[PDB]
Each structure stands twice: as structure tokens, then as C-alpha cells.
Amino acid sequence: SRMQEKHMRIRVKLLDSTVELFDIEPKCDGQVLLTQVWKHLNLIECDYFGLEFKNVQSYWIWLEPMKPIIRQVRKPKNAVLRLAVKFFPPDPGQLQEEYTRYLFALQLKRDLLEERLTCTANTAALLISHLLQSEIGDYDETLDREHLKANEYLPNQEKSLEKILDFHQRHTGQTPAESDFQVLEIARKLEMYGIRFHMASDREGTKINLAVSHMGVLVFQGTTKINTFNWSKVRKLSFKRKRFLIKLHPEVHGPYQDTLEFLLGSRDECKNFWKICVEYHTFFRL
């Protein structure tokens, strides 16, 4: 006999791609699972992190700490979630623990592989060369080529093999911590560092990509950044159905207007973007 409810088995894909299994009562709030994961990892700076899952609409959503797990994931038999950085600070090299910096380097590795973190060809190759130094150590042509055959860093990485090898040869003797630090140093200056797009349209019907960062709410047209609504200028964030509302400094040359509106693809996509913006503001401001 059991004095607890039957537990659900949840697979958690970690940042190194290993999978750990966690058994939890479906009615438990997300925090229960989050804390088991932080313990398994001995992750001190856990406030930067979350667990995410992919919905039927194929987009990633964050596990909420104060809602029952079963109501969020819905799959009693095989819930799968993955560890991810939620909050990207401007200077991750200044994170307090080597372990946290290690996890951030792994996150950036994933964002490069998944084509979220974009950059010039040489810069991508340089990033990968430091990732190689951290994982397999000093350059050797055979060791590098065999590793790159069995481990993916970028789609069509073979195009950049020569550049990757060339840069790796420069990193002789560098430790994994040094290598992670270099990954963070290179990545943090990239326009796409920590960026996840949420598709929307503006007042004129132009298709844009919304994002949020430690600096504020961001607007991209295609891949080009066209606005930064800095937190200091943001008075309120709201949403109604598919509409995302930013209350901001008013326009100078027009009848008084303090609010910009963007239309997302659905109520829930809108709500999810609103949520991450509010969370970013709380994390990085006051």
C-alpha cells in the first residue's frame, strides 16, 4: 500500500544531453520538480534556469513553479522537459560559479546548433573551437575530425571544418574553465545572444519578431533589430487576447499616445510572451 499518490515519470534532458528520470506526484507544483533538478545538479545559481517543454504547436514553453505539473504537461506516461537558461545576463563570465559558466557555455552550444544564436562564419568556427578545447582538449587533427563526425555543433558544420581546426590549434593548453569563459566572452557581444523570437505584427501590419532581454523589449524585422524599448521607458506591460501592449514614453508629434500594440499569433502565444517579459523585468530591474 501507498500513502502517496501514484507518481508520474518525467524525463529531464540536461544541457549535456544526458537524461535523468524524476518521479513526482502530478499534483505537485512545478517547484517540486525544479528543486529536485537543482539538487541532482547541485546548481547554486539556479535562479537563471528553468525547465521547458515543446507543445503541440511545436514552440517551447516554461514550466511554471506555482502551478501543478500535470496541468501543464498533460502526458502522465511520458512527460519530457529540458534544462535551459531562462535569464541571460549581459556578463555571464561574472556568474559566481565555474559550474554555472559551464552550463551557460553548453546552452550557447545548443543555441548555435539549433540556429538560434547566429553570427559570422568565422565567429561560429571560433566558438566551436573553444567548445572543442573544453571537451576534448588540445588540438589533434584525427581526434578533432573523429569527434566532429560523431558530435554535431552546427548544421552543415563540414563547411567550416578547416576554420574550426585552424582556430582550435591556437588554444594549446587552455583549461575547460578558460575555454568556457572564452565562449561566454564571444557570445555575449552577439546581437542574438539570449534571443528567442516571437512572431507578431505591428500597427501597420508589418511582420516583426518580438524578443526580450536584460535591456528591455526588443523588435526585430526579419533578423534586423529595429527597436529597443529599454526598461527605464516601460511603464506597464499588458496583454488582451492576441494583443501585446507596451505602455511607454508618449510620442512627441501626435495626439497623446503612450501605448504600442503588437498582434501575436494566438492568445496563448501572446500570454506566454507577456509572461517572459514580466519575468525579465522583475529579474533584471529593481
Residue numbers in the entry: 37 to 322
Recite the paper's sentences.
FARP1 (FERM, RhoGEF and pleckstrin domain-containing protein 1) and its close homolog FARP2 were identified as guanine nucleotide exchange factors (GEFs) for RhoGTPases that play regulatory roles in neuronal development. FARP1 and FARP2 share a conserved domain architecture, containing a N-terminal 4.1, ezrin, radixin and moesin (FERM) domain, which is followed by a long linker (~200 residues) that connects to a Dbl-homology (DH) domain and two pleckstrin homology (PH) domains. We determined crystal structures of the FERM domains of zebrafish FARP1 (zfFARP1), mouse FARP2 (mFARP2) and zebrafish FARP2 (zfFARP2). As expected from their high degree of sequence identity (>60%), the structures of these FERM domains are very similar to one another, with root mean square deviations within 1.0 Å.
FARP2 also interacts with PlexinA family members, contributing to both Plexin-mediated repulsive axon guidance and dendritic development. The corresponding site in the FERM domains of FARP1 and FARP2 contains a negatively charged residue (Asp97, Glu100 and Asp107 in zfFARP1, mFARP2 and zfFARP2, respectively), suggesting that it cannot serve as a phosphatidylinositol binding site in these FERM domains. In particular, the FERM domains of FARP1 and FARP2 contain a Lys-Arg-Lys-Arg (KRKR) motif in the loop connecting strands β5 to β6 in the F3 subdomain, which is highly conserved in FARP1/2 from different species. Overall, the surface of these FERM domains show highly polarized surface electrostatic potential, with one side positively charged while the opposite side negatively charged. Interestingly, both the FERM domains of mFARP2 and zfFARP2 form similar head-to-tail packing patterns in the crystal lattices, as a result of interactions between the positively charged and the negatively charged faces of the proteins. These packing patterns lead to a linear array of the FERM molecules, which may cause the oligomerization and precipitation of the proteins. The first arginine residue in the KRKR motif (Arg277) in the FERM domain of mFARP2 makes a salt bridge with Asp216 from the neighboring protomer in the linear array. The linear packing of the FERM domains of mFARP2 and zfFARP2 in our crystal structures suggest a potential mechanism for the oligomerization of these FERM domains. The KRKR motif in the FERM domains responsible for phospholipid binding is buried in the oligomerization interface. We speculate that the oligomerization, if occurs in the cell, could be a mechanism for regulating membrane targeting of FARP1 and FARP2.
